[PDB]
Short mmCIF file of all heavy atoms in Angstrom, two decimals:
data_model
loop_
_atom_site.label_atom_id
_atom_site.label_comp_id
_atom_site.label_asym_id
_atom_site.label_seq_id
_atom_site.Cartn_x
_atom_site.Cartn_y
_atom_site.Cartn_z
N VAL A 87 116.29 98.38 92.49
CA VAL A 87 115.17 99.13 92.96
C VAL A 87 114.31 99.53 91.78
O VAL A 87 113.10 99.42 91.74
CB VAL A 87 115.65 100.41 93.70
CG1 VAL A 87 114.42 101.21 94.19
CG2 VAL A 87 116.72 100.09 94.80
N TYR A 88 114.97 100.10 90.81
CA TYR A 88 114.31 100.55 89.63
C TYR A 88 113.53 99.41 88.98
O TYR A 88 112.40 99.54 88.52
CB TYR A 88 115.44 100.99 88.68
CG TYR A 88 114.87 101.62 87.42
CD1 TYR A 88 114.51 102.96 87.40
CD2 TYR A 88 114.75 100.87 86.25
CE1 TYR A 88 114.06 103.55 86.21
CE2 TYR A 88 114.26 101.43 85.07
CZ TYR A 88 113.92 102.78 85.05
OH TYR A 88 113.38 103.36 83.92
N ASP A 89 114.14 98.24 88.95
CA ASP A 89 113.50 97.09 88.33
C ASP A 89 112.30 96.59 89.09
O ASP A 89 111.41 95.99 88.52
CB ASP A 89 114.53 95.96 88.23
CG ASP A 89 115.36 96.08 86.98
OD1 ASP A 89 115.29 96.96 86.15
OD2 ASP A 89 116.22 95.14 86.92
N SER A 90 112.22 96.84 90.40
CA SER A 90 111.06 96.39 91.13
C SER A 90 109.85 97.33 91.04
O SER A 90 108.71 96.96 91.37
CB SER A 90 111.47 96.26 92.57
OG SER A 90 111.63 97.56 93.06
N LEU A 91 110.06 98.56 90.57
CA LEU A 91 109.00 99.56 90.52
C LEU A 91 108.11 99.53 89.29
O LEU A 91 108.55 99.18 88.21
CB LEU A 91 109.63 100.98 90.63
CG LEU A 91 110.34 101.26 91.94
CD1 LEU A 91 111.04 102.61 91.87
CD2 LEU A 91 109.30 101.29 93.04
N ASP A 92 106.91 100.09 89.44
CA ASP A 92 105.97 100.31 88.34
C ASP A 92 106.40 101.53 87.49
O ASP A 92 107.32 102.26 87.87
CB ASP A 92 104.57 100.60 88.84
CG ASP A 92 104.52 101.78 89.83
OD1 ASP A 92 104.76 101.41 91.07
OD2 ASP A 92 104.23 102.95 89.52
N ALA A 93 105.73 101.81 86.37
CA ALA A 93 106.20 102.94 85.57
C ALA A 93 106.20 104.34 86.23
O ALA A 93 107.11 105.12 86.01
CB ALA A 93 105.69 102.95 84.13
N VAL A 94 105.19 104.67 87.04
CA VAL A 94 105.18 105.98 87.62
C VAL A 94 106.30 106.18 88.60
O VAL A 94 107.07 107.15 88.56
CB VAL A 94 103.80 106.27 88.20
CG1 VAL A 94 103.65 107.71 88.69
CG2 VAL A 94 102.87 106.11 87.02
N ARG A 95 106.38 105.24 89.49
CA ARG A 95 107.41 105.32 90.50
C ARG A 95 108.82 105.35 89.93
O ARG A 95 109.73 105.99 90.45
CB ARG A 95 107.17 104.24 91.55
CG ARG A 95 105.81 104.45 92.30
CD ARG A 95 105.73 103.44 93.43
NE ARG A 95 104.62 103.63 94.32
CZ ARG A 95 103.42 103.07 94.14
NH1 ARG A 95 103.15 102.33 93.06
NH2 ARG A 95 102.50 103.27 95.09
N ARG A 96 109.08 104.69 88.82
CA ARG A 96 110.43 104.80 88.26
C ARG A 96 110.76 106.23 87.86
O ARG A 96 111.92 106.63 87.92
CB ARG A 96 110.64 103.94 87.02
CG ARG A 96 110.31 102.49 87.22
CD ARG A 96 110.45 101.69 85.92
NE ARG A 96 110.41 100.27 86.26
CZ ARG A 96 110.62 99.26 85.45
NH1 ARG A 96 110.96 99.45 84.19
NH2 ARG A 96 110.55 98.01 85.95
N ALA A 97 109.74 106.92 87.35
CA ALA A 97 109.92 108.28 86.92
C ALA A 97 110.29 109.03 88.16
O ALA A 97 111.18 109.86 88.13
CB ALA A 97 108.65 108.88 86.31
N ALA A 98 109.70 108.68 89.29
CA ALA A 98 110.10 109.40 90.50
C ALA A 98 111.57 109.14 90.87
O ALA A 98 112.33 110.00 91.39
CB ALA A 98 109.18 109.11 91.70
N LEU A 99 112.02 107.92 90.65
CA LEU A 99 113.40 107.63 90.98
C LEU A 99 114.31 108.33 89.99
O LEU A 99 115.39 108.76 90.31
CB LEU A 99 113.67 106.09 90.88
CG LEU A 99 115.07 105.60 91.26
CD1 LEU A 99 115.40 105.91 92.71
CD2 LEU A 99 115.20 104.11 90.97
N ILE A 100 113.90 108.42 88.71
CA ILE A 100 114.79 109.12 87.78
C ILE A 100 114.97 110.64 88.17
O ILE A 100 116.04 111.28 88.08
CB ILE A 100 114.28 108.92 86.36
CG1 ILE A 100 114.34 107.45 85.93
CG2 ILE A 100 115.02 109.80 85.37
CD1 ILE A 100 113.47 107.12 84.70
N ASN A 101 113.88 111.22 88.64
CA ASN A 101 113.83 112.62 89.04
C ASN A 101 114.85 112.85 90.13
O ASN A 101 115.68 113.75 90.05
CB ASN A 101 112.37 112.99 89.48
CG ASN A 101 112.13 114.49 89.68
OD1 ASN A 101 112.96 115.14 90.34
ND2 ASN A 101 111.05 115.02 89.09
N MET A 102 114.82 111.98 91.17
CA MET A 102 115.85 112.13 92.21
C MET A 102 117.29 112.08 91.68
O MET A 102 118.14 112.84 92.08
CB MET A 102 115.74 111.06 93.28
CG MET A 102 114.47 111.14 94.14
SD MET A 102 114.42 109.87 95.45
CE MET A 102 115.68 110.58 96.53
N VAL A 103 117.57 111.12 90.80
CA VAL A 103 118.90 110.92 90.26
C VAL A 103 119.33 112.09 89.42
O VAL A 103 120.46 112.54 89.49
CB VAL A 103 119.03 109.59 89.50
CG1 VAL A 103 120.37 109.53 88.78
CG2 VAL A 103 119.04 108.45 90.50
N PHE A 104 118.39 112.63 88.66
CA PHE A 104 118.67 113.77 87.80
C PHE A 104 119.07 114.94 88.68
O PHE A 104 119.96 115.72 88.39
CB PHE A 104 117.37 114.13 87.04
CG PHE A 104 117.55 115.21 86.02
CD1 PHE A 104 117.70 114.92 84.67
CD2 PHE A 104 117.42 116.54 86.42
CE1 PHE A 104 117.79 115.93 83.70
CE2 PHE A 104 117.54 117.56 85.46
CZ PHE A 104 117.71 117.26 84.11
N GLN A 105 118.37 115.03 89.79
CA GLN A 105 118.54 116.12 90.72
C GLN A 105 119.79 116.03 91.58
O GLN A 105 120.51 117.00 91.81
CB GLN A 105 117.29 116.35 91.64
CG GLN A 105 117.46 117.62 92.51
CD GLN A 105 116.45 117.85 93.62
OE1 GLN A 105 115.46 117.12 93.75
NE2 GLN A 105 116.65 118.95 94.37
N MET A 106 120.03 114.85 92.13
CA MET A 106 121.10 114.74 93.08
C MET A 106 122.23 113.86 92.67
O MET A 106 123.22 113.75 93.38
CB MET A 106 120.59 114.50 94.54
CG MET A 106 119.91 113.19 94.83
SD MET A 106 119.01 113.26 96.42
CE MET A 106 118.35 114.91 96.31
N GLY A 107 122.10 113.23 91.52
CA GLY A 107 123.17 112.37 91.08
C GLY A 107 123.05 111.04 91.77
O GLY A 107 122.39 110.84 92.79
N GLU A 108 123.66 110.11 91.10
CA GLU A 108 123.57 108.70 91.42
C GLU A 108 124.18 108.39 92.76
O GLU A 108 123.77 107.52 93.54
CB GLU A 108 123.96 107.86 90.17
CG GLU A 108 124.95 106.72 90.36
CD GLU A 108 125.34 106.21 89.01
OE1 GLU A 108 125.23 106.89 88.00
OE2 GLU A 108 125.73 104.97 89.05
N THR A 109 125.07 109.29 93.04
CA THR A 109 125.81 109.37 94.24
C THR A 109 124.93 109.87 95.36
O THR A 109 124.92 109.28 96.43
CB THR A 109 126.89 110.40 93.93
OG1 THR A 109 126.61 110.99 92.65
CG2 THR A 109 128.18 109.62 93.89
N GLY A 110 124.23 111.00 95.14
CA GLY A 110 123.35 111.56 96.15
C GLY A 110 122.29 110.55 96.59
O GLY A 110 121.99 110.40 97.76
N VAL A 111 121.75 109.84 95.61
CA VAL A 111 120.70 108.87 95.81
C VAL A 111 121.15 107.59 96.52
O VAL A 111 120.44 107.10 97.40
CB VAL A 111 119.96 108.69 94.52
CG1 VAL A 111 118.77 107.77 94.75
CG2 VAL A 111 119.53 110.08 94.07
N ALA A 112 122.35 107.13 96.21
CA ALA A 112 123.06 106.02 96.87
C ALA A 112 122.92 106.13 98.39
O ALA A 112 122.80 105.10 99.06
CB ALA A 112 124.54 106.20 96.63
N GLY A 113 123.03 107.40 98.89
CA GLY A 113 122.88 107.79 100.32
C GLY A 113 121.47 107.63 100.98
O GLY A 113 121.31 107.94 102.16
N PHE A 114 120.46 107.10 100.23
CA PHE A 114 119.10 106.82 100.65
C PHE A 114 118.81 105.33 100.52
O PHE A 114 117.71 104.82 100.78
CB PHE A 114 118.16 107.50 99.62
CG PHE A 114 117.87 108.96 99.84
CD1 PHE A 114 118.71 109.96 99.34
CD2 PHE A 114 116.76 109.36 100.58
CE1 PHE A 114 118.44 111.32 99.55
CE2 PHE A 114 116.44 110.71 100.75
CZ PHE A 114 117.30 111.69 100.26
N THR A 115 119.73 104.60 99.96
CA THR A 115 119.37 103.22 99.62
C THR A 115 119.25 102.34 100.78
O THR A 115 118.47 101.40 100.82
CB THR A 115 120.17 102.52 98.49
OG1 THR A 115 121.53 102.38 98.86
CG2 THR A 115 120.06 103.30 97.19
N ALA A 116 120.08 102.65 101.70
CA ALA A 116 120.10 101.83 102.86
C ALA A 116 118.77 101.86 103.56
O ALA A 116 118.45 100.98 104.36
CB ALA A 116 121.19 102.30 103.82
N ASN A 117 118.01 102.90 103.27
CA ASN A 117 116.78 103.01 103.99
C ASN A 117 115.56 103.20 103.12
O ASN A 117 114.74 102.32 103.00
CB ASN A 117 116.91 104.11 105.06
CG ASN A 117 117.80 105.22 104.51
OD1 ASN A 117 117.37 106.01 103.65
ND2 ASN A 117 119.07 105.14 104.86
N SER A 118 115.39 104.40 102.56
CA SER A 118 114.18 104.65 101.82
C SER A 118 114.07 103.71 100.65
O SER A 118 113.00 103.24 100.32
CB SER A 118 113.99 106.12 101.38
OG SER A 118 114.44 107.08 102.33
N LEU A 119 115.19 103.51 99.97
CA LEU A 119 115.17 102.67 98.80
C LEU A 119 114.81 101.26 99.17
O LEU A 119 114.12 100.58 98.43
CB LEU A 119 116.45 102.74 97.93
CG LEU A 119 116.65 104.17 97.38
CD1 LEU A 119 117.43 104.15 96.09
CD2 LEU A 119 115.31 104.89 97.17
N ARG A 120 115.28 100.81 100.30
CA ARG A 120 114.93 99.48 100.67
C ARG A 120 113.43 99.35 100.89
O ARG A 120 112.78 98.37 100.46
CB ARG A 120 115.73 99.10 101.88
CG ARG A 120 115.46 97.73 102.44
CD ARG A 120 116.06 97.62 103.84
NE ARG A 120 115.08 97.78 104.93
CZ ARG A 120 114.85 98.88 105.71
NH1 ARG A 120 115.55 100.03 105.59
NH2 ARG A 120 113.88 98.80 106.64
N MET A 121 112.87 100.39 101.52
CA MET A 121 111.46 100.38 101.79
C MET A 121 110.70 100.41 100.50
O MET A 121 109.62 99.90 100.39
CB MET A 121 111.02 101.55 102.65
CG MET A 121 111.30 101.35 104.13
SD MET A 121 111.35 102.95 104.96
CE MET A 121 112.20 102.61 106.51
N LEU A 122 111.25 101.11 99.53
CA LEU A 122 110.55 101.16 98.23
C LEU A 122 110.53 99.77 97.57
O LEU A 122 109.54 99.29 96.98
CB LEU A 122 111.15 102.22 97.28
CG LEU A 122 110.83 103.63 97.79
CD1 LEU A 122 111.65 104.67 97.02
CD2 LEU A 122 109.35 103.95 97.67
N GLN A 123 111.68 99.15 97.62
CA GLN A 123 111.83 97.85 97.08
C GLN A 123 110.84 96.88 97.74
O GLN A 123 110.30 96.00 97.08
CB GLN A 123 113.25 97.36 97.34
CG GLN A 123 113.65 96.38 96.26
CD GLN A 123 115.12 96.06 96.33
OE1 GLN A 123 115.93 96.90 96.75
NE2 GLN A 123 115.42 94.82 95.99
N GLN A 124 110.60 97.06 99.04
CA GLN A 124 109.66 96.19 99.72
C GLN A 124 108.23 96.60 99.59
O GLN A 124 107.35 95.94 100.16
CB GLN A 124 109.92 96.11 101.22
CG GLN A 124 111.32 95.59 101.52
CD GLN A 124 111.56 95.57 103.00
OE1 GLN A 124 111.25 94.57 103.65
NE2 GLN A 124 111.93 96.73 103.54
N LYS A 125 107.99 97.70 98.86
CA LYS A 125 106.65 98.22 98.63
C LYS A 125 105.94 98.82 99.85
O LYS A 125 104.70 98.88 99.90
CB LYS A 125 105.75 97.34 97.73
CG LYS A 125 106.48 96.98 96.41
CD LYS A 125 105.59 96.41 95.30
CE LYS A 125 106.41 95.98 94.09
NZ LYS A 125 106.84 97.11 93.29
N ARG A 126 106.70 99.34 100.82
CA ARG A 126 106.10 99.98 101.99
C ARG A 126 106.06 101.45 101.72
O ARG A 126 106.97 102.18 102.13
CB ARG A 126 106.94 99.71 103.23
CG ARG A 126 107.28 98.24 103.47
CD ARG A 126 108.43 98.12 104.49
NE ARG A 126 108.37 96.93 105.32
CZ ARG A 126 108.07 95.68 104.87
NH1 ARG A 126 107.81 95.43 103.57
NH2 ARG A 126 108.04 94.65 105.74
N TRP A 127 105.03 101.85 100.96
CA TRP A 127 104.90 103.19 100.45
C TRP A 127 104.82 104.25 101.51
O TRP A 127 105.55 105.23 101.47
CB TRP A 127 103.77 103.34 99.42
CG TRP A 127 103.75 102.23 98.40
CD1 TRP A 127 102.66 101.47 98.10
CD2 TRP A 127 104.80 101.77 97.52
NE1 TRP A 127 102.95 100.55 97.12
CE2 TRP A 127 104.24 100.75 96.68
CE3 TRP A 127 106.09 102.22 97.25
CZ2 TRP A 127 104.96 100.12 95.64
CZ3 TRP A 127 106.80 101.60 96.23
CH2 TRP A 127 106.24 100.56 95.42
N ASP A 128 103.89 104.08 102.44
CA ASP A 128 103.76 105.06 103.49
C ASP A 128 105.01 105.25 104.30
O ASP A 128 105.36 106.37 104.57
CB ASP A 128 102.56 104.74 104.39
CG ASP A 128 101.28 105.12 103.69
OD1 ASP A 128 101.17 105.26 102.49
OD2 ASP A 128 100.33 105.36 104.53
N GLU A 129 105.69 104.14 104.65
CA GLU A 129 106.92 104.20 105.42
C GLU A 129 108.05 104.82 104.69
O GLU A 129 108.81 105.61 105.26
CB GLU A 129 107.40 102.82 105.87
CG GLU A 129 106.24 102.04 106.52
CD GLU A 129 106.48 100.57 106.66
OE1 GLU A 129 107.60 100.08 106.86
OE2 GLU A 129 105.36 99.91 106.68
N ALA A 130 108.23 104.40 103.43
CA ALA A 130 109.34 105.05 102.69
C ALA A 130 109.16 106.59 102.59
O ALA A 130 110.09 107.38 102.71
CB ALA A 130 109.40 104.53 101.29
N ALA A 131 107.92 107.00 102.39
CA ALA A 131 107.59 108.42 102.26
C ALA A 131 108.02 109.20 103.51
O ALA A 131 108.59 110.27 103.42
CB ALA A 131 106.12 108.61 101.97
N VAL A 132 107.75 108.65 104.69
CA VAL A 132 108.17 109.28 105.91
C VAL A 132 109.69 109.30 105.96
O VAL A 132 110.31 110.28 106.34
CB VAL A 132 107.58 108.53 107.11
CG1 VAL A 132 108.20 109.00 108.40
CG2 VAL A 132 106.08 108.77 107.19
#
């Protein structure tokens, strides 16, 4: 996911990880993260 993102958005992903741990974030991958990877910004946000 991180590798597919631009520089700003990666900073956003680091923020989540810092906050909730790699573990906490793992729990969003199935969905939001996938949407991020596919570049569906509006959808992932919801």
Side-chain angles (χ1 to χ4, degrees):
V87 179
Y88 185 83
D89 275 2
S90 71
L91 296 174
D92 54 275
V94 188
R95 297 187 172 90
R96 305 177 168 187
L99 182 62
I100 295 163
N101 190 313
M102 293 182 73
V103 171
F104 185 100
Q105 186 190 354
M106 67 195 40
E108 132 189 22
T109 8
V111 185
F114 276 87
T115 64
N117 35 75
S118 323
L119 298 206
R120 178 194 101 258
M121 281 158 198
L122 290 169
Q123 208 170 329
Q124 301 178 89
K125 309 194 185 284
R126 309 164 148 43
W127 315 127
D128 284 21
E129 311 165 32
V132 169

